[PDB]
Symmetry: C2
Subunit: 561 residues, 2 copies
């Protein structure tokens, strides 16, 4: 059933308002808009829109982790830096040690932000190195080189639809057997902080800084900045391996509008129609089984009606059922993230399916009077909605239509205990980082909305994280005790915690192999001194499951010209 499917097994993102994807999903469920509203000419201009949707810490990085010099880190634009960080995290989110999954392709997209222009005129050996680090192919290749990945690795771009070209490239590589996994990343991070813009005739930008998708009041888009990477995997293999799967990608297609439209910057109903139709034909998925569509959904006066006209024209070929499929756009929450737009949409879809719930689209009061929702398949999904139990898995589609005419549509599908004590091995590159890890893990235990399985959590840190030089092991019976020990560690009250410094890895010996509580303590002590223990020994008759958990706590050092 899953031969033509790919599993989404890891996510890492950093979007306006949200430091990670779990916080992102929370903010989407709650209807939160993360656009922020606040030089004399501009201040006084009645058409200046005082709005910015960005992430923080574009300048922060941990070059030492990757053996990058401080000088070279400064030569690196923020998109390169954050896509590397997020690639590392996406694999850890999935519960894999990157160097243990070499059969992984890498596809990345980012903006031309002119970062290298910021460097000193004299600078621009430095001239050549900084030029190389500015070339777009350096992004995915740097990921491959630093993570240990050997599949095809390259940059892809189609303006707004870029993320979806990344996703298409992953789909193709994995379904063909070229690779087992793929990383897909997108980031549009400007090399300046420029608050607001001036609303004017020659531009289809919102009059008030809000994206009002599908609304009567929709008068233009607004941009936002962020970074995201996801890890995909051959579906049958993910199921076999017991991975934590957010959702399945069942198919995806691309086209270009060509000449058949009035102008280079215009939208095209015909191009949208045809790519939707192409994806229905390749997947053979019937439009009656789609419960939700994450639209391109930019909130332009001409684009929103065009988008719905294309969907209605195609679905009419298949059905007359009414009001069964919701429509929304994450651009309402965080703006149009350019190269990352398609991945913001994808991550919304995947989390909706994972949580069996739709999140609302926002800034909506009344339907655009040019759009006829009534009596069509579609309603505007302006509330939370539980996805009902039913026999067919729920499916959700996603659109992204780029400036220049390259269109993409994709269809996704929903996919659906030990005994204490539990051993949580943490490690990082140095003591400061390790302490930060404990602090991350503690915050996670406190902030998680639901109870957290220590069986699964421990197994994730055992088998899903690279063992580094600074080590600590926490043996605990329950979450509150584990948190107490983490807080003791954070505070320097270290006395009863197994610790290792400058640890060097080694193969277990025959001698080392020569009660269950005693044995657990012993494995832990071997690991903290560097022995590559077989954590499988903990689980003769339990079956832990890798879960989404805090990922490496990178240093936050500033590099900027």
């Amino acid at each position: 059933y899953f031969d033509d499917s790919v599993a989404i097994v890891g996510i890492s993102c950093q979007f306006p308002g949200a430091k990670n994807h779990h916080e992102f999903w929370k903010q989407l469920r709650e209807g939160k808009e993360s656009v922020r509203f606040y030089p004399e000419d501009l201040i006084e201009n009645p058409d200046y829109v005082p709005a910015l949707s960005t992430i923080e810490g574009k300048d922060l990085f941990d070059p030492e982790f990757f053996h990058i010099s401080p000088k070279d880190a400064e030569f690196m634009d923020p998109q390169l830096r954050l896509l590397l960080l997020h690639s590392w995290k996406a694999v850890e989110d999935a519960g894999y040690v990157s160097k243990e999954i070499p059969k992984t392709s890498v596809y990345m997209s980012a903006s031309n932000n002119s970062y290298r222009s910021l460097l000193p005129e004299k600078t621009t050996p430095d001239g050549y190195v900084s030029w190389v680090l500015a070339q777009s192919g350096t992004i995915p290749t740097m990921v491959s080189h630093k993570l240990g990945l050997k599949g095809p690795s390259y940059f892809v771009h189609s303006n707004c639809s870029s993320s979806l070209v990344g996703l298409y490239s992953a789909y193709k590589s994995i379904t063909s057997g070229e690779s087992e996994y793929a990383l897909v990343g997108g980031a549009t991070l400007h090399a300046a902080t420029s608050i607001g813009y001036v609303h004017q005739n020659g531009l289809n930008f919102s009059s008030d800084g809000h994206v009002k998708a599908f609304d009567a009041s929709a008068d233009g888009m607004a941009g936002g900045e962020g970074a995201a990477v996801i890890l995909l995997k051959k579906a049958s293999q993910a199921v076999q391996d017991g991975d934590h799967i957010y959702a399945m990608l069942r198919g995806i297609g691309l086209n270009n509008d060509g000449a058949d439209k009035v102008g280079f910057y215009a939208p095209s109903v015909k191009g949208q129609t045809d790519v939707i139709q192409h994806v229905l034909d390749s997947t053979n998925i019937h439009p009656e089984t789609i419960s939700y569509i994450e639209a391109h959904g930019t909130g332009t006066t001409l684009g929103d009606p065009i988008e719905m006209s294309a969907l209605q024209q195609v679905y009419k070929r298949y059905t007359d059922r009414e009001q069964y499929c919701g429509i929304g756009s994450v651009k309402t929450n965080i703006g149009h993230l350019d190269t990352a737009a398609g991945l913001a949409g994808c991550i919304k879809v995947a989390m909706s399916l994972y949580h069996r719930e739709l999140a609302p689209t926002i800034n909506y009061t009344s339907p655009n009077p040019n759009i006829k929702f009534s009596g069509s398949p579609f309603y505007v999904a302006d509330k939370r909605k539980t996805l009902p139990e039913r026999e067919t898995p729920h499916r959700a589609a996603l659109s992204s239509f780029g400036l220049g005419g390259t269109n993409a549509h994709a269809i996704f599908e929903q996919y659906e205990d030990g005994q204490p004590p539990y051993i949580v091995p943490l490690s990082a590159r140095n003591k400061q980082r390790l302490t930060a890890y404990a602090s991350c893990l503690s915050g996670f235990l406190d902030e998680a909305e639901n109870d957290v399985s220590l069986h699964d959590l421990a197994y994730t840190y055992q088998t899903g994280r690279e063992a580094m030089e600074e080590r600590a092991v926490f043996i605990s019976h329950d979450r509150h005790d584990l948190n107490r020990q983490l807080q003791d560690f954070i505070n320097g009250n270290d006395q009863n915690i197994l610790r290792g410094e400058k640890v060097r890895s080694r193969e277990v010996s025959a001698q080392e192999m020569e009660t269950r509580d005693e044995k657990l303590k012993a494995l832990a002590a071997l690991w903290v001194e560097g022995a590559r223990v077989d954590w499988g020994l903990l689980y003769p008759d339990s079956a832990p499951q890798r879960i989404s958990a805090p990922t490496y706590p990178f240093a936050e050092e500033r590099f900027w010209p």
Copy 2:
């Protein structure tokens, strides 16, 4: 047989020394180096700093094309203001895309099922624009985004296949070629355009040779030679058109060569550093391409190497080829090795296409062109007793039963490797040549190009095929002239009359608007010059063939900040 093959049917290039691919092949066959070296005089004019001139390590070399700044925006209905916002890579790849389709004998709007893949450098062109400029800020930003290149091509040519930018540093063109191969062999598109261009946004004569750059001590690329001590750059642009192989054959296209298979990988972590080469990565990609094609290495007559002339890279390249081919054969000295970088330098994103075009034209002309700057083998490489010889002479490819095959390698900085295998593929007067262009000045230029071609062609030119190419392989435009001729010398005389203003004997049309045996020919001609869409299907009992012929003579207007 050809199910897994793609035909190369059109080429357009502009490389150091060569204004087109025919001149390029001539120059290769003759062993010409097109790197320019500057005297002290020459450096002073062109105004290079006397402190560079006096530096004993300054290398006074440049391998570039001319006229990076020249474009014809009116042809594409681009405003002069927007033309200035366009970087030269975007401009030249558009021009060369138009030309490649004409080189193939197709009217671009008649081949909508065409994918588009482009690669180019980050040259910081937008940074050159005024600060006030940077609606202009947004439009120039859009035009600076990499996805605009292929999508501008799709839009302006009328193409509706997937369209996007790809990049993997020096191997980029081969990622483009791979994407074309996959799109066509899967049935996604019938055709594809593949382009590459690295054009810097400055003219910077020479460089300073120094430790910690792997750049030639004297500006020559000395591939495989004992004196090889580093690479040297060049700039250029190229686009080719590929087509489903069986359909190219069925349509009677002019086929330069077939592409039989191609593959990609990344070196990953298994090497000492980001910027280093990798014998393992190369070995593995070559092996992958042999296994996917099932082509035996004894049938390969020539390899166009990545061939950069670095002290460590050249031996690594041969070690990988030797290690793979050893597993198949003990035969000796049957396969040549060479590198076009010896002629024109390392063309970065266009390096792979320069190699492809050399291979294609070698196969088409059944001859190998020499690799240059080669006296004596690198003593770390053992050619003796291996399959390989350095192809430092012209060589005729003998008649044999198995078609000749030639492979191509491109190994990017950041570790994305590509390898491809290519294979050789083998009416009565008067004639009517209907020429048309956008205005009278372009039409005159067209006549002049056509006349020059007739004079410069090394062999006799079939008027039967030439006329058919202009009839059926060129968009009929508003300024029209028809030349009815019995032979090449008369045709040339009429073209020269036209060029000189003596056009009273030539049927002409101005501001023509399209609308729905000797006697009959004259009648078609008069209809066509007034805009009637005549059926050139003149050919009840002859079968003309489309050929490579002069393409649209774009205006050469300067746009530069």
